Amino acid sequence: DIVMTQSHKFMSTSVGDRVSITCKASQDVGTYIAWYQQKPGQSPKLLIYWASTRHTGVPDRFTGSGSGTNYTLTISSVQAEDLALYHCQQHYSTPYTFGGGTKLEI
Amino acid sequence: TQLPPAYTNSFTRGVYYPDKVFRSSVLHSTQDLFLPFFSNVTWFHAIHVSNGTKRFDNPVLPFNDGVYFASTEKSNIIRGWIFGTTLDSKTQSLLIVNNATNVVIKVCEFQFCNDPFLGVYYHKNNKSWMESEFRVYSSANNCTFEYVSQPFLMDKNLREFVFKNIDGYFKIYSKHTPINLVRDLPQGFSALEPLVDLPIGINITRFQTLLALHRSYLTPGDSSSGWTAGAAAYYVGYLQPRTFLLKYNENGTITDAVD
Amino acid sequence: QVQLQQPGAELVLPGASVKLSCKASGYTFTNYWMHWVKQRPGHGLEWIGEIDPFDTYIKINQKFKGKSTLTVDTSSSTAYMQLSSLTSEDSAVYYCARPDSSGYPVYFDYWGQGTTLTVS
Amino acid sequence: CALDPLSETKCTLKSFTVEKGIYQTSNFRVQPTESIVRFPNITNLCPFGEVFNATRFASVYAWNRKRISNCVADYSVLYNSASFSTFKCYGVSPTKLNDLCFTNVYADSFVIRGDEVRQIAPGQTGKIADYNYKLPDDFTGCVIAWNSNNLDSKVGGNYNYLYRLFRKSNLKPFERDISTEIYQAGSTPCNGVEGFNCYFPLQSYGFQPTNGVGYQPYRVVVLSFELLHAPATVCGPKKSTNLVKNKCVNFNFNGLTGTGVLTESNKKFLPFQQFGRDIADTTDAVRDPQTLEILDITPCSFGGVSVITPGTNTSNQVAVLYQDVNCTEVYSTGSNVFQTRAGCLIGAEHVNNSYECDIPIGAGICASYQT
Ligand SMILES: *[C@@H]1O[C@H](CO)[C@@H](O)[C@H](O)[C@H]1NC(C)=O
Ligand SMILES: *[C@@H]1O[C@H](CO)[C@@H](O)[C@H](O)[C@H]1NC(C)=O
Ligand SMILES: *[C@@H]1O[C@H](CO)[C@@H](O)[C@H](O)[C@H]1NC(C)=O
Ligand SMILES: *[C@@H]1O[C@H](CO)[C@@H](O)[C@H](O)[C@H]1NC(C)=O
Ligand SMILES: *[C@@H]1O[C@H](CO)[C@@H](O)[C@H](O)[C@H]1NC(C)=O
Ligand SMILES: *[C@@H]1O[C@H](CO)[C@@H](O)[C@H](O)[C@H]1NC(C)=O
Ligand SMILES: *[C@@H]1O[C@H](CO)[C@@H](O)[C@H](O)[C@H]1NC(C)=O
Ligand SMILES: *[C@@H]1O[C@H](CO)[C@@H](O)[C@H](O)[C@H]1NC(C)=O
Ligand SMILES: *[C@@H]1O[C@H](CO)[C@@H](O)[C@H](O)[C@H]1NC(C)=O
Ligand SMILES: *[C@@H]1O[C@H](CO)[C@@H](O)[C@H](O)[C@H]1NC(C)=O
């Protein structure tokens, strides 16, 4: 089915810098995507269930923007707690597929 | 011009199956609204055309508990009945209308016409009678029930009907039997099998018989020369609380009764 | 406060079967479908399959057909998941994901604790 | 008492020695193996195939009303479809919706974009939300949305559907604006100029294959469920199991709610008659609700259990008589079982020669202690 694979190997920015989190898509299936923040040693946490609106308990630094061909997530400000795995999963058909994930390091 | 009525002997007719239970070769005693034996039955003359002046006498009778209805018609002149209490659009009323296609029973706030009936014309090319117009009600509102079923009235013979309204339910029973009597109801026993049951849930205390009128009857003149509707007659009895000893044969058909 | 409790830390010898359970608390057990996911550091996360509660509608992902099996018990809000003939490469972490909506597709809004499977 | 038949006999007589003879101690009875329920061939499923499966849907500027009632609807069936995407249910969940009953189950149909799917939430605001359709804050029911880019999508461009871009007044839940009065763009009065002063409220959809998720035409419905202080006409359907004969089962034949052994019968009903009775005024036969057969009903076999023993001084062996019971339905079985008109005799062996009667069993059979 649709396969999720981010482009950038890892996220490498200092505190407060603006960085982008890519998530490529096999084909055009709309903005049917999600984002998970899976800390090393912790279960994934929801960040972006939809690009337009953000779910409960999320910082306002994270931005939602769906390109349509691939999914990119930009963070305005980065703190210590922002270092985790960024898993992206599409929800368009019955088979679901996750992204490769990226671990943020300074 | 009102046509005077008459009287006739019911002679044990009008017995129906009180319920759905099957019973074989047993005598079961039940207390149900029944037509009393030998209780005399009103004999109405719906239309009497002789001069040829048209006589429109289809009076609206009161629905006192149940009603036993019978008629001896071979032209399918009778097409339905009216049921209700106020017979206007203020309250819903039960209607029955039948033509060549099927039987339609509508329970709406029908605003009744002065003298409802059914109009039919003769198709000269196809050599058959098919409907022209329906002249029953001014308008219908708050339609809740729309029942359709195969024509049971269509197609010398006697047709017996019973109407009962209990527990917000309407019940119709029927039986078809060839007979050789005209003025008086034939003697003999034949149980009335239930035809349909409906959850209408409206009060009914007043009824009238419907008719099918040929196109010649609707002429402006007071005399009709293309339609011979002299056979328009029917019998009406009234049901009462009675105890009956119904006899069931081995097949389960009611073959005798005792009042 | 939704309690998604997973004991974890289960090890089964090769060629045998495994059974795992996931208790659900803090919400209504009736109004949510079940979706199973698998965690692997080798190539990221992946989806095991879905099962609807109090029924037997089976829909598993094309990657994990045959070996994977799902069963649902209404009592105690537990989910029953079984593999057969465990291999060495099946050393990973298993999860039970509560979905956002009752109908497919879902994005697995809330994730419980991780159950680690390892050949012993 | 419950150790063995001899001890049950001792308990019944309240004596430690029982004299030769037959004593009634227990009472055999057969319990139903399973519950059987059947309902006839009638479904009257609500017209969901017409509302969902169609050629052209009503546009959003006049959101249509369906008024579905007096029928049973299996909502989990569509919940188990293969096309639907969005199933965000408000209030009553579909699994409990199948169990629960509502008087009327309204359905809607309008054409909205992917970004405006969230606007169908109760109290949500937006362009379509605040102009075309708005859901009340206290809504109970489900709204279903899914992607359909092959039925209602055009390569050149789908301009059939259109929305209310502008609206002077404030929309209320369950309200529509079918009139096409011209909008007043500015403070100047509007007199049908269609220019700066007057704008056209109904702006056309632009649907293209390359358009994003927020521009794609989706087929959405609002399953409005409301309570009107009326008898409930919409409820979940009920299943009928398979049929079993010559076995003790619990049957619910459209309300017969009895228990017994169903078997084939040669008796024939009248076409309108449903079930039968007898002199005792008990349910005797029931016709199959699904097909046209007659199933005679016989009650569960039961009868007294009589322990046939000689005196305890003579021996401690016993024989148990199951009165009015067939040995197919029956000391534990398998020890010289025997059938007679009295019932099943267990523990005693039939002998061809005839002696004088010792312990009267019934119907000419007499039991005795012998080599
Ligand atoms: C009943 O009707 C018959 C008609 O045959 C009539 O002779 C008789 O007088 C009637 N009885 C009463 C009490 O009206
Ligand atoms: C009369 O017949 C026509 C067609 O012949 C049918 O459409 C209509 O429903 C009938 N009217 C009734 C049954 O009242
Ligand atoms: C229409 O009929 C229903 C029941 O059939 C009744 O509840 C309702 O009040 C009626 N509407 C009127 C009389 O305006
Ligand atoms: C008849 O009218 C009474 C009110 O006078 C009402 O309670 C009852 O339900 C009605 N019966 C039917 C069958 O409509
Ligand atoms: C009863 O059923 C038998 C069975 O065919 C039939 O021949 C008979 O005419 C029926 N009626 C009576 C009165 O026996
Ligand atoms: C019903 O839906 C199926 C699924 O898309 C479709 O193939 C079929 O043509 C539809 N039937 C209609 C629209 O009559
Ligand atoms: C009732 O439905 C079943 C289901 O297929 C069918 O086989 C049976 O023939 C139906 N009943 C009758 C009387 O046809
Ligand atoms: C047991 O007692 C009975 C009398 O109660 C007697 O007839 C019988 O012979 C006794 N049996 C033996 C084996 O002594
Ligand atoms: C007991 O059941 C069997 C079933 O094989 C039957 O053949 C036999 O006639 C039954 N006995 C009686 C007394 O009905
Ligand atoms: C008893 O008699 C029956 C028939 O009368 C016979 O079949 C059976 O073999 C006999 N058994 C003995 C032990 O005599």
Author numbering:
A (entry chain Q): 1 to 29, 36 to 57, 65 to 72, 74 to 80, 83 to 109, 114 to 126
B (entry chain A): 22 to 71, 74 to 178, 187 to 290
C (entry chain P): 1 to 9, 11 to 30, 35 to 59, 62 to 72, 74 to 111, 112A, 112 to 127
D (entry chain C): 291 to 620, 636 to 676
Sentences copied from the publication:
Here, we identified monoclonal antibodies (mAbs) capable of cross-reactive binding and neutralization of animal sarbecoviruses and SARS-CoV-2 variants by screening single mouse B cells secreting IgGs that bind two or more sarbecovirus RBDs. To deduce recognition and neutralization mechanisms, we used single-particle cryo-EM to solve structures of Fabs from the seven cross-reactive mAbs complexed with a SARS-CoV-2 6P spike trimer. Here, we characterized mouse mAbs elicited by mosaic (M8a mAbs) or homotypic (HSW mAbs) RBD-nanoparticles using both structural and functional analyses, showing that mosaic nanoparticles induce potently neutralizing antibodies that cross-react between animal sarbecoviruses and SARS-CoV-2 VOCs. Structural analyses revealed neutralization mechanisms, potentials for intra-spike trimer cross-linking by IgGs, and induced changes in trimer upon Fab binding.
M8a-3 was the most consistently potent, exhibiting low half-maximal inhibitory concentrations (IC50 values) against all pseudoviruses evaluated. The class 1/4 RBD epitope identification explained the lower neutralizing potency of M8a-3, M8a-31, and M8a-34, since this class of anti-RBD mAb tends to show less potent neutralization but broader sarbecovirus cross-reactivity, than other classes due to the more occluded nature of the class 1/4 epitope. A 3.1 Å resolution M8a-3 Fab-spike complex structure revealed Fab VH-VL interactions with “up” RBDs using all six CDRs along with residues within the light-chain framework region 2 and 3 (FWRL2 and FWRL3). The class 4 and 1/4 epitopes of M8a-3, M8a-6, M8a-31, M8a-34, and HSW-1 were buried when RBDs adopted the “down” conformation but fully exposed in the “up” RBDs. The other class 4 and 1/4 mAb Fab-bound trimer structures showed larger inter-protomer RBD distances (up to ∼70 Å), corresponding to ∼11–34 Å more outward displacement of RBDs in comparison with unliganded or class 1- or ACE2-liganded spike trimer structures. (C) M8a-3 Fab-WA1: open trimer confirmation with no potential for intra-spike crosslinking. Encouragingly, M8a-3, M8a-28, and M8a-31 neutralized all Omicron variants against which they were evaluated (BA.1, BA.2, BA.2.12.1, and BA.4/BA.5), although the Omicron lineage of SARS-CoV-2 had not emerged at the time these experiments were initiated.
